[PDB]
Every structure is written in C-alpha cells, then in structure tokens.
Paper text:
In the free hexon structure there are 30 residues missing between 135–165; half of these residues are now resolved in the complex. The remaining missing piece, between 145–159, has an unusually negatively charged sequence (EEEDDDNEDEVDEQ) and forms the core of HVR1. The visible part of HVR1 forms a very extended loop that projects straight from the top of the spike. Of these, HVR8 forms a finger-like projection into the center of the VH-VL binding site, whilst HVR2 contacts VH exclusively. At one side of the interface, D52 from L2 makes a bifurcated hydrogen bond with residues K431 and Q434 from HVR8. On the other side, E181 from HVR2 makes a bifurcated hydrogen bond with the peptidyl nitrogens of G53 and T55 from H2. At the center of the interface, E435 of HVR8 hydrogen bonds with the main-chain of H1 residue G32. A number of contacts are also made between HVR8 and H3, including between the side-chain of Q97 and the main chain of G433 and E435 and between the main-chain atoms of S99 and N436.
When TRIM21 detects invading virus-antibody complexes in the cytosol, it catalyses the synthesis of multiple ubiquitin chain types to drive a dual sensing and effector response. Here we investigated the antigenic features associated with a potent TRIM21-dependent anti-human adenovirus 5 (Adv5) IgG1 antibody and determined the kinetic requirements for efficient stimulation of antiviral activity upon infection.
Numbering used by the authors:
A (entry chain H): 1 to 218
B (entry chain L): 21 to 233
C-alpha cells in the first residue's frame, strides 16, 4: 500500500544525490511518483514527477540538474540531482496522489546534508553551579556537548532512566561542527549525595563517554 | 507559480476553540486547495481536499471552504490530537506548491522562567577554550528578550542560542544559550547577566553570576 526510499544522505558539493523509491500495493503504470523536499524553516518544495506512461515534469528551477527515471516491472523510481550545493539540504520524499484526490501516500524520508567535513566526535564538558544562594530546594545541572559531525546524538541522564525534567535542546552549527546542550532539574539535598552521571551516544562516530558531577569549594 | 500564502503562522488556542486558517493563492486554483496535518516524526496526513471534501476517516470538526484564490480551513472544537502543524496545498498546476505552515500552540496562561545561571569549569578547559552556558527551563510565552551582557552592554560576539518544541505533557517551552569565550577573553569583565523580559515581573528579572560572589 506504501513507498520506501534509499540513502546515501551525507555528501559534499558537486556530487549526485541518488535516491530510489521502491513501491508496493499499486502499479507504477497506474500512478505518478512525485519528489518533494522540506528544507529546514521552509515549506515543502516540489521538485518533479514521473507519471504512469513515463512523461516526467520537472520544476523549472531544478531542470538544469534533475532527472527521474523508472522501471514499472521492478516497482522502482530513480531520482537523481546532478550537482549539489549547501542549500540542497533537506528531507527528500517520494509521494503519490489518489485517482481522484491529492497527495496522500509518502515515502519515509531521506535526510541529506551537503558539506565536506570529516566525522569528528564530540567532547563532553559537564556543568555544576557556582555557589551563591541555594534556597527553593531544586537546582538544575548541565552537560554541554561540543564540536561534532555528522548528526544526530542521544544525550541521556544516568543511563536512559532519569528523564522527568530532562530538556535536551536542538543543536546549532559552528563552522562544520555542531554544539548542543542538555539539562536536568533535580532536588537539592540528594545531588549533593546521589549525583547524576551524564553520558552520550554517537552512531556514525561510536564514542559513549560518561561524566560524573562535582562542584567547586567556595 | 502558484504561490500559496498561508496565514496566520501561529494560533495559540485552548481545548474546545473554533479556529480558521486562511490560504491565498496568487492565481485561481479553481477548487483544488487541500489541507494537511503534520505531527513531527509522522508523515503528512491529508484532511480536506478540493477545498471542502473530507478524506477517509476524518471527524466533521475539520471542515473547509473557498473557490478561486480565497480558501478557509476551520476546526470548530480543538483537542490533544489537533496540536500540530497545518498547511494548504494546491495541485491545480505544476509546479505543485504548499503553504508555509500554521503551528498550533496551547495556552498554559503565564509561568515563571526557571533561570539557572552557569559558569564553565577546570574540567571544561582541557583544550585551552571555554563556554558560559545558561538554561531557562519552562516559561510562557516564548516572547523573551534575553542577553549575555557585561556591565550593561550589547556586544553579542559568541552568543549561541537554542529553543525547543512545546513539550506536550507540560505545554511550556525551554531555552538554552552558550556565550563562547577563548583562553584570554575569559579574564576581562568582573561579572555577567542572564536576562529575562517577561510580563510576570515588569521590573526586569535579572539573575547574574559574578567571578567573586
């Protein structure tokens, strides 16, 4: 009844994006497959379509460097995009229309990022407060993670268990390096004693380093 | 193109409200305007098509209307599961085009900002470079003039903010900054401020950290 894509997602300038949409529960000879993308902070943007007979219609703004092919028997549609740039960064979808009725079936996604950075790992610098007033009986601690590529990362508190007021934040770019921060709000008197150990998990890098909390002696 | 101009970008609401979104098309689209729902992680969900027709398995609280260029999308009673992005789409003509989004908020009427003023550590300075963090967990609304100032200044060099999704359980935001500073930049001004300009207290709710106290 549905559609499914490929990678690879992460590539550098002047290189071909090459997704493949594999289809089931309907024939390519009965329906078009459209290719759409969502750029971050933007609406959806339509790139092109291949209709049932093979006709193909590209958005003019990508027509210099876009191509859609298909094989009806194999239930495959092949998207390509011929010379990438840094603002070609988005989730690229394949999708399909009803008979009858508009776009209503979607591929799962392809996260793609355009940049020329080596896979460098983060550096976990933990945080605990700087003295002064300790009233209210609640104080928030931190765990700052700097300088990584690519994304994403899991920022857990005490091995994926403590997560009641855990607010991990969306990252931000720092010249081919991401930096994001994490917080946890826990009561005063037991941290101090039963302190929380912070850790991190990077998939394409593979480092899992832990850090415990100790303040300074003012 | 056809450009689909969607309005308004945010509606703030509480449960049970009646709320209309609007889409203006640069060209007559006849009646080929459609409306979708976006819950993050999940893929888009077609609600209404051809302006007013309702898709497979969609409750009659979602309606719509319009012909030509002016279209309307009502929800007469909102709920937990209507708390998401919404967008118009036109398929009258290639290139196919979309509205920019209407995000739906929820109203936890006023709240106080849990400002947690921070410094670095010796444990940070392991490579000769540091960073002065500031968390602000749970506040309402997002209208917050924050600044990492030094003696009442606006030199914003190295200020490196963040924001979050309105967490569905407690329905209030959070914030995160990172005032980056080098080896020698780290000794100059004696103290610095994590500001807040909330209507919770109109006298500006400053919560500083100094190098001495």
């Amino acid at each position: 009844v549905q559609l499914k894509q490929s990678g690879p997602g992460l590539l550098q300038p002047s290189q071909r994006l090459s997704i493949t949409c594999t289809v089931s529960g309907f024939s390519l000879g009965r329906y078009g497959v459209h290719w759409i993308r969502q750029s971050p902070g933007k609406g959806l943007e339509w790139l092109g379509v291949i209709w049932r007979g093979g006709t193909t219609d590209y958005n003019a703004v990508f027509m210099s460097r876009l191509s859609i092919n298909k094989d009806d028997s194999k239930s495959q549609v092949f998207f390509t995009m011929n010379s990438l740039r840094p603002d070609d960064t988005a989730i690229y979808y394949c999708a399909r229309q009803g008979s009858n009725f508009p776009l209503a079936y979607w591929g799962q996604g392809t996260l793609v990022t355009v940049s020329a950075a080596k896979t460098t790992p983060p550096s976990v610098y933990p945080l605990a407060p700087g003295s002064a007033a300790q009233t209210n009986s609640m104080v928030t601690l931190g765990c700052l993670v700097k300088g990584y590529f690519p994304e994403p990362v899991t920022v857990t508190w005490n091995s994926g268990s403590l997560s009641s007021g855990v607010h991990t934040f969306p990252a931000v770019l720092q010249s081919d390096l991401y930096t994001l921060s994490s917080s946890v709000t826990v009561p005063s008197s037991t941290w101090p004693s039963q302190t929380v150990t912070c850790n991190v998990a990077h998939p394409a890098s593979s480092t899992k380093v832990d850090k415990k909390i100790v303040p300074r002696d003012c | 193109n056809i450009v689909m101009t969607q309005t308004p970008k945010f509606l703030l609401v509480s449960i049970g409200d009646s709320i209309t979104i609007t889409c203006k098309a640069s060209q007559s689209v006849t009646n080929d305007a459609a409306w979708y729902q976006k819950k993050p992680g999940q893929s888009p969900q077609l609600l209404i098509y051809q302006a007013s027709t309702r898709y497979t398995g969609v409750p009659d609280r979602f309606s719509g209307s319009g012909y030509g260029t002016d279209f309307t999308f009502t929800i007469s009673a909102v709920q937990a599961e209507d708390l998401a992005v919404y967008f118009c789409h036109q398929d009258y003509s290639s290139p196919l085009t979309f509205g920019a989004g209407t995000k739906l908020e929820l109203k936890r009427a006023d709240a106080a900002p849990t400002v947690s003023i921070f410094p670095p550590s010796s444990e940070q300075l392991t490579s000769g470079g540091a960073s002065v963090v500031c968390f602000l967990n749970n506040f309402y609304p997002k209208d917050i003039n924050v600044k990492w100032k030094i003696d009442g200044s606006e030199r914003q060099n190295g200020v490196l903010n963040s924001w979050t999704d309105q967490d569905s359980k407690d329905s209030t935001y959070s914030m995160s900054s990172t005032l980056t500073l080098t080896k020698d930049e780290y000794e100059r001004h004696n103290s610095y401020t994590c500001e807040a300009t909330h209507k919770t207290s109109t006298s500006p709710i400053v919560k500083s950290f100094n190098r001495n106290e």
